[PDB]
Amino acid sequence: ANLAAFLVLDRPEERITGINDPRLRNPSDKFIYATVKQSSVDIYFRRQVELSTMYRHMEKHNYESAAEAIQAVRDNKLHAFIWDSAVLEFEASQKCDLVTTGELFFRSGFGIGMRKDSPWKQNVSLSILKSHENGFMEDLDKTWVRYQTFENMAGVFMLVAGGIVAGIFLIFIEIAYKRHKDAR
Amino acid sequence: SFMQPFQSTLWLLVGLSVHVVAVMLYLLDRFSLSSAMWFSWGVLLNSFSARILGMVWAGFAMIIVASYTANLAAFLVLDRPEERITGINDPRLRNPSDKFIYATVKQSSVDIYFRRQVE
Amino acid sequence: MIGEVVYQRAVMAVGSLTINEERSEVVDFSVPFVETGISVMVSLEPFSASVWVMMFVMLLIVSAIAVFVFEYFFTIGKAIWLLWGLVFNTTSKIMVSVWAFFAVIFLASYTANLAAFMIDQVTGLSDKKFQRPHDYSPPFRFGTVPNGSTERNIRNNYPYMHQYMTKFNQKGVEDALVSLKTGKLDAFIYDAAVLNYKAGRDEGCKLVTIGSGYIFATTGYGIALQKGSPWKRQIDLALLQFVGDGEMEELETLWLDIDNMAGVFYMLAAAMALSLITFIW
Amino acid sequence: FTIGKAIWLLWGLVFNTTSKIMVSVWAFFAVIFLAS
Amino acid sequence: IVTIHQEPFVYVKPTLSDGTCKEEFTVNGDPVKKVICTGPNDTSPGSPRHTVPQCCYGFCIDLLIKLARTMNFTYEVHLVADGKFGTQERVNNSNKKEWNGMMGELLSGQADMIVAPLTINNERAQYIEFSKPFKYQGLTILVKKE
Numbered sequence: 001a002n003l004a005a006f007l008v009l010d011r012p013e014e015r016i017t018g019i020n021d022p023r024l025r026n027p028s029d030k031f032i033y034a035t036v037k038q039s040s041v042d043i044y045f046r047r048q049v050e051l052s053t054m055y056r057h058m059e060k061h062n063y064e065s066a067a068e069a070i071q072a073v074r075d076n077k078l079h080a081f082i083w084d085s086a087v088l089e090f091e092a093s094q095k096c097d098l099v100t101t102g103e104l105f106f107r108s109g110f111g112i113g114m115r116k117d118s119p120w121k122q123n124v125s126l127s128i129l130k131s132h133e134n135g136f137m138e139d140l141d142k143t144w145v146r147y148q149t150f151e152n153m154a155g156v157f158m159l160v161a162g163g164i165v166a167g168i169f170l171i172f173i174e175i176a177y178k179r180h181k182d183a184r
Numbered sequence: 185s186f187m188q189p190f191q192s193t194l195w196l197l198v199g200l201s202v203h204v205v206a207v208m209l210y211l212l213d214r215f216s217l218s219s220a221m222w223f224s225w226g227v228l229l230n231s232f233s234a235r236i237l238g239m240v241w242a243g244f245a246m247i248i249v250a251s252y253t254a255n256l257a258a259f260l261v262l263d264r265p266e267e268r269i270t271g272i273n274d275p276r277l278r279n280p281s282d283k284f285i286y287a288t289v290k291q292s293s294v295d296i297y298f299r300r301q302v303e
Numbered sequence: 304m305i306g307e308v309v310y311q312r313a314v315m316a317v318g319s320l321t322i323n324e325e326r327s328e329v330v331d332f333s334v335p336f337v338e339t340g341i342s343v344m345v346s347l348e349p350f351s352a353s354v355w356v357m358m359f360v361m362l363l364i365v366s367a368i369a370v371f372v373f374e375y376f377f378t379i380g381k382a383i384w385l386l387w388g389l390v391f392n393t394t395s396k397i398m399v400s401v402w403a404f405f406a407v408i409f410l411a412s413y414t415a416n417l418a419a420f421m422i423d424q425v426t427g428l429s430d431k432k433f434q435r436p437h438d439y440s441p442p443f444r445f446g447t448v449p450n451g452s453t454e455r456n457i458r459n460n461y462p463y464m465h466q467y468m469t470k471f472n473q474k475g476v477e478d479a480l481v482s483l484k485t486g487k488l489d490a491f492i493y494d495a496a497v498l499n500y501k502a503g504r505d506e507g508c509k510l511v512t513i514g515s516g517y518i519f520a521t522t523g524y525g526i527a528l529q530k531g532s533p534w535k536r537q538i539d540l541a542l543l544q545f546v547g548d549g550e551m552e553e554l555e556t557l558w559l560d561i562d563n564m565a566g567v568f569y570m571l572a573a574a575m576a577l578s579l580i581t582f583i584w
Numbered sequence: 585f586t587i588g589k590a591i592w593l594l595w596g597l598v599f600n601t602t603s604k605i606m607v608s609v610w611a612f613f614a615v616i617f618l619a620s
Numbered sequence: 621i622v623t624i625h626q627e628p629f630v631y632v633k634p635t636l637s638d639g640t641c642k643e644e645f646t647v648n649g650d651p652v653k654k655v656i657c658t659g660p661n662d663t664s665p666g667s668p669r670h671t672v673p674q675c676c677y678g679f680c681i682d683l684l685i686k687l688a689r690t691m692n693f694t695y696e697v698h699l700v701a702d703g704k705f706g707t708q709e710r711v712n713n714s715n716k717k718e719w720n721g722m723m724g725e726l727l728s729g730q731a732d733m734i735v736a737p738l739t740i741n742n743e744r745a746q747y748i749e750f751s752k753p754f755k756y757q758g759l760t761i762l763v764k765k766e
């Protein structure tokens with residue numbers, strides 16, 4: 001029964017699906033999560049008109065920067081944080097103490113801002129296609145995006161070790177006193 | 185499965201281990217009788233060199249039986265089979281399967297609903 | 304479709320075509336909507352106590368201190384025998400009883416760890432298997448679909464690899480599927496989206512790509528338009544609105560033991576070593 | 585001990601000559617039942 | 621060009637006291653280009669902003685250098701004063717519709733190109749042209765591991 005109760009009621013840490021998570025549909029104040037600013041996350045939230053009020057309640061503020069948001073999340077000030085998957089997974093690779101959860105939604109790629117009248121759009125697009133074709137871009141991505149039995153059991157092992165050493169230490173003098181009493 | 189689920193050679197392996205520990209115990213006793221097998225069976229199931237070897241064999245046997253019990257418990261826990269349907273939303277119902285036969289009676293309200301939701 | 308667009312026979316055309324370097328030179332297309340690329344589609348310690356030595360040293364030291372305390376109360380004839388009997392199968396019995404309790408707790412924790420534990424081949428083109436398929440006795444027949452972005456890419460990247468793949472070139476899709484099912488080809492190279500769809504709708508889910516993120520050349524699909532056609536702006540704006548309104552996500556959705564051998568070997572080695580030591584002594 | 589010995593052994597094997605094989609397989613059945 | 625400070629792609633830090641930025645090597649023993657990127661000293665609003673030269677590097681700058689070498693361009697990396705992407709927002713007292721951040725910098729003509737991890741958006745593409753994406757991804761949820 002102890003094994004069953006250990007395997008159940010565990011610390012699964014729900015992988016927070018995000019847009020499909022029922023617990024995120026209720027804007028509970030005990031679980032605070034918001035974006036940084038008016039950027040693409042806020043654009044998507046405003047564009048999604050079915051739960052615009054829910055998205056507004058979820059945000060409830062605008063953070064100064066993504067670095068400050070990640071620092072607050074690391075300090076456990078924010079329960080959850082929403083941003084681009086590449087940044088989150090790079091942060092997770094840098095520090096395993098931060099984990100990325102949820103599937104991929106709104107798969108929109110990056111881009112290069114340019115004026116419409118600028119004639120370099122074709123050159124930039126062709127250069128990007130060439131880079132994707134060659135291994136130079138692949139190697140650059142690998143260099144820049146690819147990076148690097150439990151606490152409870154160790155703690156209980158230390159506790160039982162302390163208990164057994166204390167027990168043998170006390171039983172030593174207990175048996176010494178018993179022998180002295182028997183052999184007066 | 186009541187018996188061993190997979191890798192049924194464990195019986196032969198434990199028999200060979202019993203034989204080798206028995207002959208080793210005989211050699212140790214000679215360099216210190218059909219009783220080594222009985223001692224091994226008693227070690228497996230509750231009812232200087234020699235004692236050390238016997239206790240090491242007993243530890244290995246208890247580890248093996250604990251692992252076997254854990255495997256049996258895990259196999260018993262693993263049952264799944266949640267009717268494999270769980271409502272209309274299921275991959276089996278989405279793509280028809282010849283092996284799994286399912287249909288309605290006739291051109292009833294269910295048939296009309298299926299025709300209306302033509303996907 | 305590219306030829307149809309070239310001769311002004313189709314101003315606008317979408318056929319889930321793969322974006323390529325040469326295609327942009329001849330024709331133009333809007334922003335991609337579905338990510339795709341080149342993918343590869345193929346068909347005691349480990350159980351519990353991975354650290355092992357970390358707790359083994361503690362067990363050794365506690366056993367040694369227990370033996371010393373019992374001697375203070377035979378070091379090897381009595382203390383060792385009792386300690387090993389606490390794991391097998393007067394006032395001095397209190398320490399024996401508590402050590403037996405510790406051994407029982409350890410056994411229960413080991414069983415719990417076993418229960419908790421019980422309840423790809425390549426990472427892309429970096430490995431030498433693709434570069435040197437002849438290093439193994441069975442040839443690494445890859446195979447590719449001709450007249451395609453994948454074969455164009457393998458032509459542009461490696462000539463010798465392209466020749467080797469053309470040595471086992473087939474039509475693909477259906478031929479690739481039947482070859483993978485029958486084991487004719489170890490792995491096949493084709494569009495990432497098609498391979499993902501086949502894996503999602505695979506018989507028994509025995510076919511799957513190599514994890515995720517191992518795409519050799521990630522591209523998109525887009526919609527091909529005629530050069531100079533006054534529809535690029537409207538098409539891209541409408542597509543971005545659709546993907547921002549959740550239409551793209553909605554369309555995408557609803558559409559597509561060994562340790563026993565190690566243990567017995569370890570126990571046999573330990574028994575042989577102990578027998579040799581006793582014979583020497 | 586006839587009555588005492590057999591029943592005592594049967595109850596002992598629940599927890600942790602040629603006839604030793606039979607008591608061994610009975611203890612195996614008992615431990616299998618306990619595991620189940 | 622105006623670039624937003626993002627850790628995965630833009631490693632913004634103050635330059636060395638000599639006036640330049642020290643050059644190091646990666647894990648595989650290759651030098652990493654570190655162009656001088658002038659920008660505001662403090663990103664907090666209501667602070668004495670100073671255009672001190674910072675050192676920014678990463679993957680986006682490498683792609684920018686490759687594009688410049690292929691098309692004979694030049695690099696003029698400068699940090700955004702606002703420190704945000706600068707999308708469409710409601711101005712005070714309903715004055716007019718305009719853009720801030722990098723988008724506003726591009727519209728005002730101060731910077732004619734944006735090299736930053738900015739995703740493709742409908743309203744962004746309404747007024748600003750976007751090239752083919754160099755990487756495809758979809759935003760996810762970040763939670764502290766425990």
Ligand SMILES: *[C@@H]1O[C@H](CO)[C@@H](O)[C@H](O)[C@H]1NC(C)=O
Nearest residue numbers: 119120122123124126127691
């Ligand atoms: C690159 O730009 C030059 C001048 O703007 C132009 O002549 C050439 O065709 C362009 N090449 C590509 C591939 O866009």
Ligand SMILES: *[C@@H]1O[C@H](CO)[C@@H](O)[C@H](O)[C@H]1NC(C)=O
Nearest residue numbers: 448449450451454455469472
């Ligand atoms: C193009 O397709 C034809 C048949 O449709 C085939 O014979 C030819 O080999 C293909 N081209 C290449 C380069 O494989």
Ligand SMILES: *[C@@H]1O[C@H](CO)[C@@H](O)[C@H](O)[C@H]1NC(C)=O
Nearest residue numbers: 687688689690691692693694
């Ligand atoms: C690059 O373009 C510039 C245009 O200002 C030209 O002066 C220079 O010679 C070109 N370099 C090469 C290698 O074509």
